[PDB]
Structures are given as C-alpha cells and as structure tokens.
C-alpha cells in the first residue's frame, strides 16, 4: 500500500529516532553526537528498517542483546534508555501499543514472551 503513500517506509524506528534527536538538544553537544553515533551504528541497522508497529519485544532485544554480548554493559544500558526515551515518544504517536522495554519486567529469560512453548 506504501505506492498510495507518500513515503514507503514511514514510522519506521530510524525516521521517529531522527525526530526524537531532532527534538534533543538537553545533553551537549559533542556527547549527543556520540549518542547519535551509537544509534546509527547499533540501534537502527536491525529495527530502523522495520515497521515500529511490528516490533516485538524481541526485535527490540536483538540491537540490545547485541551490545549487551558485546561486551559493554554501559553501552547496553544507556541505549536501553535511548530507546526507552523512542518507545515512548513512539507510543505517543501510535506506532506502538506499549514499550517492550517497560513490558518486559525480565520474567522470560529469552526473546520470547513464553518460558513454556507448550
């Protein structure tokens, strides 16, 4: 249907983060470069290409777990609250229905939302 709209990937994680920076001038400078960086470089590859709307708790836990195996708990952590800061602003326009980072309370140790397949 995206040939009827006016721009094919829209509400996608990459285009609302652009705007959540766009709207962020809070931290400095030079840090919210490097924070921008870090988005580029590990939080839009995999979920920035997706429909937000789609995107599980799973999806979400992918760009984590990357960096989280990555070996930079810090890292991890802070774009855990970047993105914190995107669902929610991606909540208040619709795209998604709550924040997967808030949903998952860290009850299932793996990327699905069931311990028990069946």
Same mark, same amino acid.
């Given at each position: ?48 290409? &997706?429909? %937000? ?5 799973? $999806? #979400?836990?992918?760009?984590?777990? *990357?960096? /989280? ?24 326009? &619709?795209? %998604? ?5 808030? $949903? #998952?309370?860290?009850?299932?140790? *793996?990327? /699905? ?6």
């Amino acid at each position: 249907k995206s040939v009827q709209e006016k721009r094919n990937n829209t509400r996608a994680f990459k285009t609302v983060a652009k705007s959540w920076f766009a709207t962020k001038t809070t931290w400095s400078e030079d840090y919210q470069r490097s924070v921008w960086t870090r988005l580029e470089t590990y939080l839009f590859p995999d979920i920035g290409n &997706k429909d %937000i709307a789609e995107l599980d708790t799973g $999806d #979400l836990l992918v760009p984590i777990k *990357k960096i /989280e195996k990555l070996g930079y708990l810090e890292i991890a952590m802070r774009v855990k609250q970047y993105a914190t800061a995107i669902m929610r602003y991606a909540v208040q326009q &619709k795209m %998604i229905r709550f924040n997967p980072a808030y $949903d #998952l309370e860290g009850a299932v140790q *793996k990327l /699905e939302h069931h311990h028990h397949h069946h």
